[PDB]
Design a protein around this ligand. Sequence first.
Ligand SMILES: CCC1=C(C)/C(=C/C2=NC(=C\c3[nH]c(/C=C4\NC(=O)[C@H](C)[C@H]4CC)c(C)c3CCC(=O)O)/C(CCC(=O)O)=C2C)NC1=O
Ligand code: NA
Lengths: 172, 172, 172, 172, 172, 172, 162, 162, 162, 162, 162, 162
Amino acid sequence: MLDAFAKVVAQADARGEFLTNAQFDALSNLVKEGNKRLDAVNRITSNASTIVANAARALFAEQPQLIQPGGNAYTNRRMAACLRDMEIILRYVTYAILAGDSSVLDDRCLNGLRETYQALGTPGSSVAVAIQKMKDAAIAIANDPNGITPGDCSALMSEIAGYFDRAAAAVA
Amino acid sequence: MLDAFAKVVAQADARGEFLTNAQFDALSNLVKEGNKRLDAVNRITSNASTIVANAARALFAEQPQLIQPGGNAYTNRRMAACLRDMEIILRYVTYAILAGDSSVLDDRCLNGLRETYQALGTPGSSVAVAIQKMKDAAIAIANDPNGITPGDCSALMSEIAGYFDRAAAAVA
Amino acid sequence: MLDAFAKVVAQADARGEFLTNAQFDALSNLVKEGNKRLDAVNRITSNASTIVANAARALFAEQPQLIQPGGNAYTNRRMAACLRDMEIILRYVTYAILAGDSSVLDDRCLNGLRETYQALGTPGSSVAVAIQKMKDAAIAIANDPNGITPGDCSALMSEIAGYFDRAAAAVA
Amino acid sequence: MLDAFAKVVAQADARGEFLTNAQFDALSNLVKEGNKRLDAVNRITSNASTIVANAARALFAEQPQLIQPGGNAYTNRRMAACLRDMEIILRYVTYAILAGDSSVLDDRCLNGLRETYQALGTPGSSVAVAIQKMKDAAIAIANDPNGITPGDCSALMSEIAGYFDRAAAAVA
Amino acid sequence: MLDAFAKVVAQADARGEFLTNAQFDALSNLVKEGNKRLDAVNRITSNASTIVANAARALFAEQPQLIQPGGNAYTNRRMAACLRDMEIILRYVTYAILAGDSSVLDDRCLNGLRETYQALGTPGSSVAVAIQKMKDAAIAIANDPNGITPGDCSALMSEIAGYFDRAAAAVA
Amino acid sequence: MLDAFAKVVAQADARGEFLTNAQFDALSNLVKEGNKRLDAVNRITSNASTIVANAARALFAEQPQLIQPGGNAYTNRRMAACLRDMEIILRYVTYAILAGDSSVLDDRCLNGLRETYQALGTPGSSVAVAIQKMKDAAIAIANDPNGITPGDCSALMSEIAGYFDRAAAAVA
Amino acid sequence: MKTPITEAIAAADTQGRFLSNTELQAVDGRFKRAVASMEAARALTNNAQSLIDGAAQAVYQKFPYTTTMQGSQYASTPEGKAKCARDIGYYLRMVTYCLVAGGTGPMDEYLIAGLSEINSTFDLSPSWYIEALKYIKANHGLTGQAAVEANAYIDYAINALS
Amino acid sequence: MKTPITEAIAAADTQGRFLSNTELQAVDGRFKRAVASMEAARALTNNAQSLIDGAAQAVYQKFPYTTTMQGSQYASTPEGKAKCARDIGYYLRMVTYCLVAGGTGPMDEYLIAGLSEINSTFDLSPSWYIEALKYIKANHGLTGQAAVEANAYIDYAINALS
Amino acid sequence: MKTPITEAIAAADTQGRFLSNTELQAVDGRFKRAVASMEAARALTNNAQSLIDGAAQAVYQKFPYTTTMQGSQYASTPEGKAKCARDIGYYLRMVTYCLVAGGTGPMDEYLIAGLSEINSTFDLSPSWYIEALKYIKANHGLTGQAAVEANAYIDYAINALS
Amino acid sequence: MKTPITEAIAAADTQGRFLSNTELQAVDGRFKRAVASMEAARALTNNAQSLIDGAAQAVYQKFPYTTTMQGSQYASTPEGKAKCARDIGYYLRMVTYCLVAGGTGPMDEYLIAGLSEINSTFDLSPSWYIEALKYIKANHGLTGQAAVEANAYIDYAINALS
Amino acid sequence: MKTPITEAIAAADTQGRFLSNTELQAVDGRFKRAVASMEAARALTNNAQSLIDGAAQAVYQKFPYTTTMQGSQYASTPEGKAKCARDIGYYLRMVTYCLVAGGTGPMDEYLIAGLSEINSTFDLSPSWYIEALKYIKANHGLTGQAAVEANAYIDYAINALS
Amino acid sequence: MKTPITEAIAAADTQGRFLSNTELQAVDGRFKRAVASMEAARALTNNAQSLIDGAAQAVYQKFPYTTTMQGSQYASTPEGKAKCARDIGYYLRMVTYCLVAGGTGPMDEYLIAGLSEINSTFDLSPSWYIEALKYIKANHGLTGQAAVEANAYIDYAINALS
Ligand SMILES: CCC1=C(C)/C(=C/C2=NC(=C\c3[nH]c(/C=C4\NC(=O)[C@H](C)[C@H]4CC)c(C)c3CCC(=O)O)/C(CCC(=O)O)=C2C)NC1=O
Ligand code: NA
C-alpha cells in the first residue's frame, strides 16, 4: 500500500527524476494540514459503533424487505454479516483518510466486492445506500464545530466524501 | 446438507410461517414408512462389494474397449479409480435414501463430476451405464421378498431409482 | 516426467505391444551417443554464470529501454527476477538435454509462462532474444573442439538448439 | 474412548473369551436403566449456564481473594478462563454419565490438568471446591422429583457423584 | 547422512589435512570390492518379503505368547505393525550395506527405538531375536554360491552381520 | 512485551491502585530524557555492521582456536551463524534501550540461549567476550561528543551497559 | 443443518465409509422420538398466538421500564411493541422447527449464529428473551414426553442467551 | 472404539458443545435396539462351537485343495487345522462383540485394521473366510430382528474381505 | 502489552530488522504526546472519588430499576452498590493506565479481553457502563489536548461495550 | 516415470540446483548397464509366446482347482484361460519395459499402482502370479548380467505380490 | 511501501481493529519530523550534481584500479564512467525519496531488494558504493536535525552494503 | 552430505521403498568414475603446495592493489598473505574432498553454505578467488577424464562465486 507521500515518490521514480520545488511545497502543505486530518480520523473512529448502528436502523427502516422472512438481512447470521460489512467498509475509509490515498481502500476492501454480492445475492444498491448514510453521519461528526480550535476544513471533507462515494460506486 | 425434515423447515422459514396441518400429517407419514427406508439402506449396504463388482464385470463385458491397451480402465491405477468411482457413487446414493433428499448426493458427489470426466477423458456414457447396472442390482436386493415382514414398498423404490437415474443423467 | 526411454515405453504400452527390433536398435544408438550427451551437459553447466551474464549484458546493450527508469529490468528487484528467469530457463534446457526429451521443459518451465509475462507486463519478445543469445553461447561452449576426444556431434547440437528455440517460441 | 459396553468387550478380548451369562445379564440391566440415565443427562445439560454461574458466585463469595487485584480470577480474561474451565469440567462430566464410564473424562479432561494449574499458578484447592458446588447443584436438579415418572435413581446419583469427586481429586 | 567416503572426508577436515597415500589406497580397495557389495544388496532386497515372513513364522512359533489373546502381536493392527517394524529394520540394514556405514541406520532407525518399545510395552528381547533370524536368512541368501562369479566375500558378510547385531543390541 | 511505562502499570494493577505523584513525576523525567534515548539507538543502529565485524575480528584474533580446523567458527556455515548470533544479540540490546526495559531481551533472546550453546557445543565464555567487545564499541559510538547538542548522558550509558552485561552473564 | 440423520451421514462421510449399523440405530431412535416431537410441535403451533401475547406481557410485567423508557430499543411505542411480539414469535417458531427436524439445527442456523452480535449492537437485553421463553416453558400446557421435548429446545435457547 | 454412544460424544466434543437432544435420540435408538442385539449375541455364543466346526468344514468342502496342498498356509496338517478353527472362532467372537457394543468398533479395531496386510504376508485367501462367514449367516438359526442384527455385522466382515 | 514503543519493536522484530528511522519517528510522537496524556491521567487520578460517586449516581438516575429490582446482578443491596462503584472505579483506573502507557494495551489486556463473556454470565447490561463512562466524559473538567486524550480512551471503552 | 535419468533430474530440481557431477555419474552407470538390460529385454521379447504358454501351465499344474472350479475368476472356461494368458503376457511385457527404461517406473505406473485393489475385487489369488513369474525366472534361459537384470525386475514384481 | 503511516495502518489491519490513539501518536511524530526531512531532501536535490561528481571521484581516488583495469565492470571507458555516475545518482535519489516518504520503504523496494544478486552477477564491489555514500555523508553540508535525517538513511544504505 | 550413494539412499527412503535396480545403477556409475576421481585427487594433493603458491601470485598479479592498499581485508601485511594462502589452500582441499566422495557434498557443507555472508562481512572480493581457482584449472597438469573430474568441481566453485 501507499500514502500521499509514497505515491508521489513512485510516480517520480517511474520517470527517474528528483522532486521539483512545486512537489516539495505541495507535500509541505500536506504536513501543515496534518492536524486537521488526525482530528477527523479520531472523531469518526471515536463514534464507530453509533455511525454503523444508526445507519443500519435507517436503512432497514427505509427498506423493510431486507429483514422480512426470506429477504438478503433476515436471521442473525445474515444481519451480523451485514453489520460487519458496514463496519469493515467504514474501517477502510478511515485508513484512507489518515494516509490521504485510496490505495488501501481499493486493494484490500473494494476490489472484488461487487462480484462477491452478486454470487451471494446481496443488493449492491442497498449496500451503497448504507455507505451513503454512514457518510453523512461521519462528516457531521468530523466537522462538528463544538470543542476544537476553529478553522476551515472544507477541502478535507470532500476528500473524506470522495472515499465514501468511491465505495458506494464500487458496489452500486 | 438437508434431509426430508430440514428442507420443509427451510422452505417454511423463507416465507416465515409455522407448519400447517397438511405439512405435519405429510411428515408423520414419512416417519411411519421409516422402517421400510432402514431395511432398504441396510440391504443395499450389506451387498456393496457385490453390486459394484458385478456391475463392473457386465460393463467391461459389454464395452471391452475400456480395458483394451490405451483405452479410459486399462492398467490397475485406472481400473481401481473406476471401481472407486462406482463405489463412491453408490455410497452417496445410500446417503440420499436414508435422508429422503438428494442434497448430499448433489452437493458432495454429482456437481462438478461431468466436468471432471471431460478433463480426464473418461466416457460419461460408460459411467452412466455402470450406474444403471448398480440400480437394477440395488433395487432387486432391496425389494427381495424373502426373509422380511411382507408389505408394499413401491413408492420407496421409485425414490431409490430417482437418485440412480439422477447420477446417470448428471454424467451422461 | 519422461526421458527418451520412457516415452517409447509409454507409446508402446498404449498399443499394448512388445518393442520391435527397430526400436531396440534405435535405443541402442541412443546409449552409444550417451558420452557426447554427458559432455554437452557438463560443459554448458560448467559455464552457467557466464552464459547468463554475457547474454544479459548484450540484451540490455541492445535494448537500453529495459533498464531505463519506468521500464520492464529497472530496479534491482526486477533486474534480479530477470537474471533468475534466464538462469531458470537455462536450468531446464540442460535437464532436457540429459534426458533427450522436452517433457520436463514443457511441463515445469514453459507451459503457463507466456500468460505470466502478459499479466506482469514483461516483453515476451525481449525474453526470447535473451534465450537466443544463451543458445549461441551454450552451443559454442558445448561444441568447442579444444580438450576432448575428437568426433562428430552435429545431431546433438540441433537437439540442444531445438530446446532453446522451443523456449523462445513459447514466449515470443 | 470407551463406554460401559466397550470396556467389557476390551477386557473380554484381552483374555480371548466369549461373554458369559453373568456378563449379558449385567449389561441387560444397564439398558433397562437407560431411561433414567438419559433424563439425568438431559436435566443437568438443560441447566448448564445456571449450575456454572451459581457455583462461581458462591466460590468467589467464599474466597474473595480470587477476584481481588493481583489474585488467580481478577481481570475479565482470567475470570472468563475460570468460567470456561468450570463449563468444560461440567461438559465432560455429562459425557461420562451418558456412556457410564470415565475414560473420556480421564483421557480428554483430567489427565494433565493439575500440572497445568501448577505452571499457571492456579489454586487447585479452589478449582476442586468449584467442582464440588457444581456437583450438589447438578445432583439436586437431576434427582428433582417434580414432573417425571416416579422411581428410584439412587445408584445413578452415586455414579454421577463419582465423576464429580474424581475431577475434584484430580486437581485438589 | 554419510557413507564410507564421506566419513573419511569429515574426519580429515576436522584436522584440516589433505588425504594421505594410506587413505587413498584404502578407499581404492573399497571401490574394487564394490561389485561384491552391489550383489549382496541386490540379493537380500530381491528376497525381502520372504526373509521378513519366514523370520516372523519362526519367531511366533518359538514364542506363541506373542500372538495369544492379550499379548504384545495379537490382533491384525499389532501383527501388521510388527511385520512393518521387521520390514523397516531390514530396509535400513540394506541402506547401511550399500554405503558401508551405519550412520543412516543409527540416525533414522535405531536411535530412539528402545525407548519407543518401552512406552508401548513391546518385548525388546523378542524384537532382537526377530532381527537375528533375518540376519541368518539374509547372510545365507547373500553368500549363496550358485549363479555368480566365484570369489571370497567373508569380510563383507561380517560387516553385514555387524549392522544386524547392532540393531539387535540397540533394542535387546 | 513491556516497556518502562507498561511495567509500572502492571505492578500498579497487581495492587489495584491509581498512580501516585511520585510515579507520574518519575515517568515524566523518563519522557524528558527521551531525546537522549533516541540518539543512542540511532547512533548504535547506524553502525551495526561495523560493531559486529570489528568485535568478531578482535575475538578471533584473541582466540584463533575458534577458526582452526575442527574448532566451534570454522567453515562458513558456522562462521555465518556466529556473525548472525552477534548481530541478533545486538538487535535485541537496541530494542531494550528504546523501551527502557529488558523484558524483550529476556523473553525473545536470552532465555534458553545458554542451553542451546551447550547442546551445540559452543563456548559460552567466547560468546560473552564477543558481547563485551560490542558493548565498548556501542558505548563509545553512542556517547561520541562530536556533532550533537552537548549534555550529560551518564545514566543512560549504564543502562545500555546493563543490557550488554546481562547478555554476557546469561551465556557466560 | 444439524439433525440425527445429517449427523449419521456426516459421521460416515468424514471417514469415507458406507453407513454401518451404528448409524442406523441412531436414525431409528430419531423416528421413534418423532411421535412426541410432532405432538409438541403441532400443539405449540395451534396455541401460538396466545403464547406470544402471554409471553410478551410477562416481559413487560417483570421489566416495566421497557414500556416507559424512551428509545428505539424499548417497547415504549407501537413500533417497539410490534418488534417485540415479532421477535418472541420468531423464538417460538424456531422451537417447533427443531421438533419437526428432531435437532437443534434450525435454531442454530436461523437464530443463534450471530445472536450476541445483534443484541450488543441494538441494545437488546438477553434477560428479556429468557423471561419470554420462561413463560412459554411454564404455560405451553403439555404433558409426558411431549413436554420433555418442547422444554429441551426451550432451555437450549435459554442457555444460548446466558 | 466406535459405538453410537461414543459417536454421539465425539460429535458434540469436536464442536465444543454440550450434548443436545440430537445426540440423546441416537442413544435411545441404541438402547431400543439392544434387545435384539443381546439376543443374537447370546444365541451365537451358546451355539459357538457347533458353528465353528460347521463353518470350518464348509471351507474344506468348497476348497478341498486347502487340506491336500503342502505348505504352512494350508490346513493340510494338525497345526493348520488348529490355526483355521482358531481364526474362524475369532471372526464369530468379534461378531458377538459388535452386537454387545452396538456398533462396528470392536471388529474394526481387533480385526479389520491391517487385515489385508496379514492375508498378503501369510498367503491367506480372503474367499476362505467369506465361505466361513457365509455358513454362519445361513445356519445361525435366528429369526426376526435378531437375525437382522447378526447378519448386518456378518456382511460388514464379508465386505471388508471383498 | 500494546504501546507505540512495543508496536515499533514488534514491527521491526517480525521482519527480523534492526529499528529504522520509520520506527524512531513513531516513538518521538509518543514522547511528544505524553505531555497531554500525563496531564489528563494525573487530573482524573486526583478527582477520582468524586467522578466514581458522580458516575454511579448517573447510572441509578437513568436506570432506577437497578436499585429496586431484587437479584444479585442489581444495585438493590449494600453488596450490589459496593460492586457497582468498584466496577466503575476499575474503568476509570484503566483509562489513566492507557494515558500513562500511551496506548490501549492496558484496557485491552485487563478489561476488554473476555468482557462480553462476563456481562453475559453475570447478567450485567453494557448500557449501565456506557452511562457511567458518559458522565466521566462530560464532567472530567479537562481542556485542550488533555481532554482529547482522556476522551479518546473513554470512547474506545464505549465502543467495546457497543 | 521413475528412471535414473528422471531421478537425477528430480533430485536437482527439488533443490533448485543445476545438475552436478553427482547426478552425471548416476546416468553413466545407467548407460553402462543398458548393455545387459537391452540384451535381457530383446531375449524375453523374442521368446515371449513360449514363456507365456509355459508359465500359464505351471500355474494350472500347481493349482489344478483353477481349471475345474466354476466361477468367472477361474480358468475353467475358454474366457478364463484367455484372461489368464493375457494377464501373464502383461507381467512379462512390463518386465521388458523396465529393462529398456532402466528402472521400476513402468511396472510401478502400469501394474503395481492399485494392484491389491484389483486382486481383492476380482478374487485373483496373488500366488497364481508368483508361480507364473517363478517359471519365467527359471526358464528365460539367460546368462551373466543379462540374467541378473531380468531377475531383479521379476523379483520386484514377486515382492509386490507378497 | 514502508512508511510510519503505512505501518500504523498495517498494524491495525492485521488485527482487524480500527485505528487507536496508539497509531495516531506515531503519525504525529512523522508529521513533526517532516520539517527536518523536507529540509534535508530539498538541500540534497539542489546540490545533487556537485555531490554525484564529488562522490564519483572519491571512489576513483580510493580505488584507482577501477579506471585502469580492462573490463565492462570497471570505469576504464566512457561507458563505464557513465554507468558509475548513473548508479551514484540512483543512491542519492533514493535517499531523498526516504526523507519525503519518512521511511526506508523507497530504498528497500527500488534498491535493496535483490542488491546482492546484482553486485554478484555484474562483479560490482560493495565497497565502491560505501566510499561513494561516505563522501555524500561528509560533504552534504547540512546541520542540526536535517543532518541527523540525511545520515540516518545514508548509513542504512551503507549497512545494506556491508 | 551429498554423494551418489547418499542420494540413492535418500531417493528410496523419502518414498519408503527398499532400493531398486534404479538406484543400484547410479552407485555403479559412481564406482566406475572413482578411477578418474581418485587420480585427480591424489595428483592435486601431491602438487598442492606449488599450486597454492602459484595461484596466490596469480591473484597478486591480476590485482596488485591487494598487496599495496592498507586494511585487514588486503594482503598488504604478513598476516594478510598468510590468510590468503590459507584460504586458497582451503578451496583446493575441498576440491579433492569432492573427488574422493564423488560429489559436491563436501564443498557445499564446509565452504558454500554462508559463503556470501562471509565475503560481505569481511570485504573479500569474489573475483580474487575466481582468479585463484582459474590458475589451478589451467596449471594442475592433468589429462583425460582426470582433468574432466578436477575441472567439474573447480567450475562448480567458480559458479558459486559468480
Ligand atoms: C430424548 C432422550 C430421552 C429421554 C429424556 C427419555 C425419557 C424417559 N424416561 C422415562 C421414564 C423414567 N425416567 C425416570 C427417571 C427419574 N425419575 C425419578 O424419580 C428421578 C428424579 C429421575 C432420575 C433422572 C424413571 C424412574 C422412569 C420410569 C422407569 C423407566 O421407564 O425406566 C421414559 C419412559 C416413559 C415414562 O415412564 O415416562 C422416557 C421416554 N427417553 C429418551 O429417549
Ligand atoms: Na467414556
